[PDB]
Amino acid sequence: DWRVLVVLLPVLLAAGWAVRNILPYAVKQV
Amino acid sequence: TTGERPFSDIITSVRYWVIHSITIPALFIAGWLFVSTGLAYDVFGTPRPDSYYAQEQRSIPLVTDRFEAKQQVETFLEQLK
Amino acid sequence: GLPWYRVHTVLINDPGRLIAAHLMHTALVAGWAGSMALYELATFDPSDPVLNPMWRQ
Amino acid sequence: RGWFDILDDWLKRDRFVFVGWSGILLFPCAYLALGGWLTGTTFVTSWYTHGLASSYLEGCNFLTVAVSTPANSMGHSLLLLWGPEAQGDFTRWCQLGGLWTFIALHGAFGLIGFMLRQFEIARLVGVRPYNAIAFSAPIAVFVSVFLIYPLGQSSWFFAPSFGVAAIFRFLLFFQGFHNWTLNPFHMMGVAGVLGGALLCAIHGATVENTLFQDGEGASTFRAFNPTQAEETYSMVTANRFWSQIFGIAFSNKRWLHFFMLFVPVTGLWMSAIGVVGLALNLRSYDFISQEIRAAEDPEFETFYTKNLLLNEGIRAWMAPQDQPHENFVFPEEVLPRGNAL
Amino acid sequence: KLPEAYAIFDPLVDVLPVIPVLFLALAFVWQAAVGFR
Amino acid sequence: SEGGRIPLWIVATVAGMGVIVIVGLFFYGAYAGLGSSL
Amino acid sequence: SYPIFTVRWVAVHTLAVPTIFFLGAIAAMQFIQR
Amino acid sequence: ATNRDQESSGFAWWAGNARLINLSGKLLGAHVAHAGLIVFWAGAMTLFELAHFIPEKPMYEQGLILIPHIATLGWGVGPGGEVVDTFPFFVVGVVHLISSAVLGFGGVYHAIRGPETLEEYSSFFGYDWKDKNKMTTILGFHLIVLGIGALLLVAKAMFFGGLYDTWAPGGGDVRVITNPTLDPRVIFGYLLKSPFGGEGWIVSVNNLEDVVGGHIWIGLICIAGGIWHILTTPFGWARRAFIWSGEAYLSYSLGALSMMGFIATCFVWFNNTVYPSEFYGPTGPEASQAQAMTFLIRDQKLGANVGSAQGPTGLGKYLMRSPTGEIIFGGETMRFWDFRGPWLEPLRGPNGLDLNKIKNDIQPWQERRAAEYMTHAPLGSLNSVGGVATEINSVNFVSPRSWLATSHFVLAFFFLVGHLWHAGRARAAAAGFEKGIDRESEPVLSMPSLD
Amino acid sequence: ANLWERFCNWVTSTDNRLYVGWFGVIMIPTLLAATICFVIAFIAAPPVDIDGIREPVSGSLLYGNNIITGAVVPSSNAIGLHFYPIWEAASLDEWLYNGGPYQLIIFHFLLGASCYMGRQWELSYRLGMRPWICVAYSAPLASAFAVFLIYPIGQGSFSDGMPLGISGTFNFMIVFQAEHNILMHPFHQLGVAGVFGGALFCAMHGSLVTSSLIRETTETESANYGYKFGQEEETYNIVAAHGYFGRLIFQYASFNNSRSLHFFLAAWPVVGVWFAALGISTMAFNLNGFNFNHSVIDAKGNVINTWADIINRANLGMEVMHERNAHNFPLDLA
Numbered sequence A: 001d002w003r004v005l006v007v008l009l010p011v012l013l014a015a016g017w018a019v020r021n022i023l024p025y026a027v028k029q030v
Numbered sequence B: 001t002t003g004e005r006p007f008s009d010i011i012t013s014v015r016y017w018v019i020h021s022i023t024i025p026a027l028f029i030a031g032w033l034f035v036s037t038g039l040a041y042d043v044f045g046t047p048r049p050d051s052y053y054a055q056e057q058r059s060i061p062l063v064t065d066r067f068e069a070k071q072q073v074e075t076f077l078e079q080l081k
Numbered sequence C: 001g002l003p004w005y006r007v008h009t010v011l012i013n014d015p016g017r018l019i020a021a022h023l024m025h026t027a028l029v030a031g032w033a034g035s036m037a038l039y040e041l042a043t044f045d046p047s048d049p050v051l052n053p054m055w056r057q
Numbered sequence D: 001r002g003w004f005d006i007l008d009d010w011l012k013r014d015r016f017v018f019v020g021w022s023g024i025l026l027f028p029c030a031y032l033a034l035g036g037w038l039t040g041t042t043f044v045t046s047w048y049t050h051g052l053a054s055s056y057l058e059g060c061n062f063l064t065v066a067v068s069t070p071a072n073s074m075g076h077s078l079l080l081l082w083g084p085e086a087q088g089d090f091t092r093w094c095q096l097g098g099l100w101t102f103i104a105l106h107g108a109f110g111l112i113g114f115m116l117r118q119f120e121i122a123r124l125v126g127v128r129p130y131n132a133i134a135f136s137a138p139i140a141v142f143v144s145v146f147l148i149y150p151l152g153q154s155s156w157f158f159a160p161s162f163g164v165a166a167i168f169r170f171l172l173f174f175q176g177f178h179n180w181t182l183n184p185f186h187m188m189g190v191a192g193v194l195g196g197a198l199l200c201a202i203h204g205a206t207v208e209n210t211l212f213q214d215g216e217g218a219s220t221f222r223a224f225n226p227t228q229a230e231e232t233y234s235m236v237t238a239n240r241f242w243s244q245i246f247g248i249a250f251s252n253k254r255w256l257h258f259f260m261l262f263v264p265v266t267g268l269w270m271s272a273i274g275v276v277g278l279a280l281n282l283r284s285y286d287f288i289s290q291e292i293r294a295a296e297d298p299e300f301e302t303f304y305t306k307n308l309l310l311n312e313g314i315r316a317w318m319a320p321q322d323q324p325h326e327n328f329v330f331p332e333e334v335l336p337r338g339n340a341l
Numbered sequence E: 001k002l003p004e005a006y007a008i009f010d011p012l013v014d015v016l017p018v019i020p021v022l023f024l025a026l027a028f029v030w031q032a033a034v035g036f037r
Numbered sequence F: 001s002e003g004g005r006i007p008l009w010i011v012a013t014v015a016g017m018g019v020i021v022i023v024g025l026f027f028y029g030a031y032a033g034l035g036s037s038l
Numbered sequence G: 001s002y003p004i005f006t007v008r009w010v011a012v013h014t015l016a017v018p019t020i021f022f023l024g025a026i027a028a029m030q031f032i033q034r
Numbered sequence H: 001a002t003n004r005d006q007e008s009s010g011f012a013w014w015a016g017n018a019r020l021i022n023l024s025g026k027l028l029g030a031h032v033a034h035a036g037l038i039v040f041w042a043g044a045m046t047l048f049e050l051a052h053f054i055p056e057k058p059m060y061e062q063g064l065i066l067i068p069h070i071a072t073l074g075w076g077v078g079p080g081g082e083v084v085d086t087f088p089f090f091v092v093g094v095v096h097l098i099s100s101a102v103l104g105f106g107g108v109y110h111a112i113r114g115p116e117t118l119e120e121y122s123s124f125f126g127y128d129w130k131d132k133n134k135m136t137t138i139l140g141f142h143l144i145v146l147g148i149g150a151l152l153l154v155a156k157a158m159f160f161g162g163l164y165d166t167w168a169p170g171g172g173d174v175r176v177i178t179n180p181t182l183d184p185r186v187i188f189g190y191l192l193k194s195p196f197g198g199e200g201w202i203v204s205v206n207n208l209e210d211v212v213g214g215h216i217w218i219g220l221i222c223i224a225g226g227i228w229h230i231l232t233t234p235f236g237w238a239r240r241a242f243i244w245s246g247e248a249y250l251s252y253s254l255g256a257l258s259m260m261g262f263i264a265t266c267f268v269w270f271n272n273t274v275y276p277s278e279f280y281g282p283t284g285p286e287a288s289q290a291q292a293m294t295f296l297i298r299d300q301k302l303g304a305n306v307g308s309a310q311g312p313t314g315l316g317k318y319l320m321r322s323p324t325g326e327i328i329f330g331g332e333t334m335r336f337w338d339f340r341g342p343w344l345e346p347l348r349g350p351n352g353l354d355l356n357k358i359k360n361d362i363q364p365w366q367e368r369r370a371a372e373y374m375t376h377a378p379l380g381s382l383n384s385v386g387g388v389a390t391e392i393n394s395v396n397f398v399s400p401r402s403w404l405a406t407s408h409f410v411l412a413f414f415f416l417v418g419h420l421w422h423a424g425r426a427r428a429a430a431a432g433f434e435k436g437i438d439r440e441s442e443p444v445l446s447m448p449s450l451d
Numbered sequence I: 001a002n003l004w005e006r007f008c009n010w011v012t013s014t015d016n017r018l019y020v021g022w023f024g025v026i027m028i029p030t031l032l033a034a035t036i037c038f039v040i041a042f043i044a045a046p047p048v049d050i051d052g053i054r055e056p057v058s059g060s061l062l063y064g065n066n067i068i069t070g071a072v073v074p075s076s077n078a079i080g081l082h083f084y085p086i087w088e089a090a091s092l093d094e095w096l097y098n099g100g101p102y103q104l105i106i107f108h109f110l111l112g113a114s115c116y117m118g119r120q121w122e123l124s125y126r127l128g129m130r131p132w133i134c135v136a137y138s139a140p141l142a143s144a145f146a147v148f149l150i151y152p153i154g155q156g157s158f159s160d161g162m163p164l165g166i167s168g169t170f171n172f173m174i175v176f177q178a179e180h181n182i183l184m185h186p187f188h189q190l191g192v193a194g195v196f197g198g199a200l201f202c203a204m205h206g207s208l209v210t211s212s213l214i215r216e217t218t219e220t221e222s223a224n225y226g227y228k229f230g231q232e233e234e235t236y237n238i239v240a241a242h243g244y245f246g247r248l249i250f251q252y253a254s255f256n257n258s259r260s261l262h263f264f265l266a267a268w269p270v271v272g273v274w275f276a277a278l279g280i281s282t283m284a285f286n287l288n289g290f291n292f293n294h295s296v297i298d299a300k301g302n303v304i305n306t307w308a309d310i311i312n313r314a315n316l317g318m319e320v321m322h323e324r325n326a327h328n329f330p331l332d333l334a
Ligand code: CLA
Pocket: E024, E027, E028, E030, E031, E037, H002, H003, H004, H005, H012, H013, H014, H015, H016, H017, H019, H020, H023, H026, H027, H029, H030, H031, H033, H034, H037, H101, H104, H105, H108, H111, H112
C-alpha cells in the first residue's frame, strides 16, 4: 500500500532527523 | 526537583526548536495525508459520503448476527456495487 | 470512648468472644432460614404447579 | 536484594511521574482507554451498530463524536479483536464496536490501577489511604453504569456510548424509560453531588474570608508558608460567623474534612445502587396509589402523572431511531401527541 | 455593502470588529514579557 | 544548545496564536463541508 | 548536567506525538466536501 | 517603574489595575483608552454590519444590532422602515472609527508617557478620592455632559429629521416630534408603575412624545444636578452613610450599571417602540400573538366563526376573556394579552379584540405582518439555527432581541457580582481588615460566647 | 442612649445567638411568611389551574399527594406576569384556584434570600472578616432567581417558573430540555463541570486532609478528638498531603499553597454554578442549546444521524406530549 509509505514518510523522516541530531548526546548518555 | 531538566529550559532552547520545527510539522503533515490519501477511511472502515447507502436504498446496514457479523458487513459493502 | 461504628472492634483480641459473636450471627442466620421457610409454608399454595408455581407466589 | 527488590527500587524512584508497581497496570490501560477514545472519535463510525455518524472524519464535532456501543446483536460479547466476531480483522472489529469494549475494559482495569496507585503512594509517603477509599465512589459509578447496567439489559448496546451527546441521550433515555429522576437512590446521589459542591464552595469561601493577616500584601496568597505550623485562617471566627448566620457551624476541623469526604462519596454510592436496580428494570417508575386514583378519576392530576406523559412521548418518539435492531414502525396515528403539537 | 470605492477594504472591514479583543490578549503578552511581576 | 535563549513570553505568544488558529480552523469547518448541514 | 531520554520524556512523547498527527488529520478533515 | 510589581504595589499581576488607584494620570489613560475601545467597536462593528447588509432583507434576518439603533433615530429609513439610503450608517461608523483613534491616542499618551499623577501638575485635573468636593465636582461635570446627550436625542427628534415611529398613522415612518410630553404627571407617572404584567414600569413607554419629553426632563434634571454637585459638597447624613474611596465609588457605579443592564434586557425584550419590530424583529409576546392572529385569519377564511369556536379545554379556540374580561387571543398566548403593536390595534375595540372588526376589517397587510412576525419569533439555537429547539437546520436566524437581551443579562449579572465584590472590599479596606484578621487582635476573641 | 439608638445596637449586635442586622430586618418577616405559606399550601392547598386552561393540578398532601409528587403549584397562565396578591382575588377560594400561594412564596423567598446574602456581608463586616462569603452564596441565589423569576419573565408567565416540589422540579427540567435543548448548552455544561467538579474536589480535599491528620489519639478513640476548637496549630501535615497528591499526578499539578487551594475550592463550583444560572437566564430569552439537527449529510443528501439527532427525537417526545391541552396552534412559541 503506497499511502502508508506516503503518509508515514514524514514520521520516519522526523525520527531519522532527530536521531541524527541527538545521536552524540544519546551515545554519551548510553 | 526529581532530576529531569526543567521544561522552561528545554522549550526555550535553540536545539529543541531545531529538532521540533522539523518533527512537529512532519507529524502534522503525516496525519493530514493519512486523511487526504483516503487511507483513514479504509483502515477504520468508515463510510465516505458516497458509501453510506446505495443509490436507491434507504435501509441502514445494521449488523444483526453476532457470529456471521463480519460476512454481514462485507455483504453490506458489496451492496454498494 | 469507642465511637458507635467501632463497638465491635472489642472482639479483635478476644478469640473466645469473637467465636461467640460468630456463633450468634450464625444462630441469627439459621433462625432466619427456619422462620422464612415457615412463613412461606404458611402462605404457599401447592394446588397448581402449572399456572401458580412457587415463583409466581 | 535480588531481581525483585531491584525492580522494586526502580519502580519507586522519586521521578517527575511516579511509576510504582501499580503503574504497570495503570499506564498501559489508561493510555489505551484514552487512545481508544481519541482514535474512535476521530476516525471510527457507528453506521453498522447504530446507524449513526460518530467521528470527526464523518463531520461530527466535539459535542457529537462518540465511540458507540456495539450492535444489540453482539449481546455481551467481550468482542475481543481475536474473538469469533472480528476474527482478527481490525477494520471489521472497529465496525462491530470493538472499540467500546476495548475502552470499557481497559478503562476499568485502569481505574483499578489508579486506585492501587493511591494506595501505593499513600503507603510510600506514610499517609492514611483515605484518597483511595474516597475514589471507591468513582469506581462504583463506573462499574454500575458501564458494566453492571448493560449486563442486566439485553446487550452492551444499551450501555452508555462514550461521547458528550451520547451521554446526554443516556440521560434522556433513563428519564423516558426508567423515570430515573423518581428514584430515591438517584435523589440521594443528587444530594451528595450538590451538597458536595456546596461544601466545596462554602469551605473554600470561608477559609479565604477568615484568613489571618500574615503579610502586608493586598493580594494575600503569598502570606502563606507550606511549612508554617499555625492555622492560616481563624476557625473560631469562622465558627461564630456561621453559628450566627446559619444556626450551626463546624467546630472540629477533622470532622469538617471527613464530612467533605463522606457526602459526595456516599452520594455516588447510592446512585450506583439505583443503577444496579435499573439494570433489571427494577425501577422506581410509579406510585401505585397514584395510578389507581388517576385511572378511576379523570380529573385527578399531579406532576407525577404529567411527567409520565412526558416519558411516554420520549419512549414513542425516540425508540425507533434509538433502538434500530427492533425495527419499530410506529404509524403517525399511534404517536402520542397533545393538541396541535 | 460599503460604497463601491471602499470595496477594496472589504476583508479589512471583516476583521476590524475583533481588534478590541486583541488588546485583552496583548495585555497578557505584555505581562509575560515582564514576567507577571 | 543552551536553555533560555528564546524568551518564554515569545514561545507562549506563538503557541497561543497557533492554538487560536487551529480551533479557528475547526469552527470554520462547522460551517463548511461535512457537518455544515448544507 | 541533564539526561535527555527519561521516563518523563517517554510519557510526554507517547501523548504528544499522536496528538500532533491527529491534529494534522482533523485539519485535513476540515476541507472534506460531501 | 513605580508600582509595577507586587512587592511595591501590594497587588499581584492579576489585580494589576488596582495599582492604578492613586495614580491619576495613568488611570486617566486607562479610562480614555477604554473609551477609545468602545468607540472603536461602535465604528468598526457598524462598518462590518453595513458591508454585510442587504437592504431588501429585514435587518433582523441579518444579525444587525447597531444599524437598527441608527435606523430607529430616523436615519436611512423611510415608511415601514424600508432602507432608503445606507450612507448615514456609513457616516456613523466611519466617524466613530475615526474618533476612536483620537481617544486611543490620548489614552496611550496619558497611560505610558504623560504624568503618572496629576495633582502636582494641575490642581484642576488632579484629585483625591477622599476629597468629597472635587469628587462631586467631576460627577457634576459628567452629569452636565449626560444631560447634554439626552438633549441631543431631543434635538434629533424635534429639529433634525425626527425619529422612526412604528406607531405613525398610516404605517410606521420617520416623524418629527413637535409636541413632546412635558407633563410630570405622565413622565414620572411611568416611574411609579408596577414592573409587573400589564404595567411594565418605564419599559411600558409606547409613544415618541413620552420618549422625547422624558429625555427633555432627564436633560434638565441632569444639567441641574450636575451644576448642583459642582457647587456643593456632601451633607452630613451623606458623609455618615457612605464609604468614600475609589473602590467604593467603583462599587456604586457597578451596582447602578447592573441595574441598568437588567432594565435594558427587559426593554429590548418587551418594548417595540424604541425597539421597532421592523428593525429588531417581533417581541416574543408579539410573535405568539401573531400566530394566534394568523390562524384566526386562516380558519375564518375557511368559514369558521372564531368568536364562538370552542376549544378542547372549553376556552375559545381563537378568542377568550382576560381575567378582567377583555377579549383576547386564545391558546397559550393568553399570557401575552398585554401585547400592543400597530398591526393588531386596528382590530381592538374598547372591550379588547373586536369580533366585527375581526370578521370584516382585517387587511392583507395585517395578515402579512402577522405571518412575518409569527415566522420570525425570537427562538433559536446558539449556532443560530432559527426556530424551536427541535427544528431541523435550514433557517439561519436568531433574533437581535435575543442577542441583546441575553448579552445584557449576562453583563448585568456579572456586574452585580462585581458590585458585591468591590462593595464588600471597600467596606473591609476602609475599616482596615481587607488583608485579614490581626492575630493579636482577633475581634471575636474579645466577644462574649454565643452560648 | 435613645430608644432608636438602643434598637440599632441590638439589631446589629455581634452578641445575638442568631445575628439580626438590617438585612435581617427584611429577611426574617419575608422568610417567615414564605415558609408558613409554603407549609400550609403544601399540606392543604386545593388543585391549581397552572396552565390557565381550567385543568387544575393537585399539589398538596391532603389532595392526593405524597412528599415526592407534591408541590406548591405555579400561578395560572391566564395571570401571566401579572401581580396576583391575595387582595387582587375576589376570595381566597379564587386566590387558591389561580395559584396565588406560589407568587406569595417565591416573592417573599426571593426578597428574603437576597437579604440572606446581604446579611452574610453584614456579619462578615461586624466580625472583622473579609467580605466575600456572600459572593459564593450569590451563585445558588442567582440560580434560584433564574428558575423562579427570570425564566418566567422571559417566557411571559409565572406558570412556567419552577414548581415548589420534587416531581414539579423534574417537570420543569424535562420541559426545559424540550424547549431549549439545555443539555447541549455550554453554560449548562459548565454548570455540570461546576457541580461534578465541586463534588470531586470536595472529596479530594476531604480525603487528603483526613489522610494527613497528625497522630494525637489512640485507636480506641475518634481521631477527631485530636483536634481542639481554637487551637493555633494546624491539625494536619500539609507538606505530607502535598507530597502525596503531587506524587499522585505530578508535583506542579498540586497546590502547596493552602490559600491558593481554598480559593480554587471556592472559585470552581461558584463560577460553574454562575454559568448554570446564566444558562437558565439566557435560555429565558430563547437563546438555546446547540442545534446540530440534520447536520451530517451524505453525498446524495441523505440525513446521516448523529447522537444529536437521537437527542432531538427524545426532545420531540417531550415537546408533543407536554401540556397536552394547552396548544391550539402548531408552534409552541412560549
Ligand atoms: C482595557 C484594558 C486595560 C487598560 C486600558 C490597561 C491600562 C494600564 N494597565 Mg492594565 N491590565 C489589564 C487591562 C488594561 N490595563 C489586563 C487585562 C491585565 C491582566 C493581563 C492587566 C494587568 C496589569 C498589571 C500587572 C499592570 C497594569 C498596568 C496598566 C497601566 C500602565 C501600563 C504600562 O505602563 O505598561 C507599559 C506597556 C508598554 C510600554 C507596551 C505598550 C503599551 C501600549 C499602550 C500599546 C499601545 C497599542 C495601541 C494599538 C497603540 C495605538 C497608537 C495610536 C493611537 C497612534 C495602564 C494605565 C500597570 C500599572 O498599573 O502601573 C502603574 C501594571 O503594573 N495592567
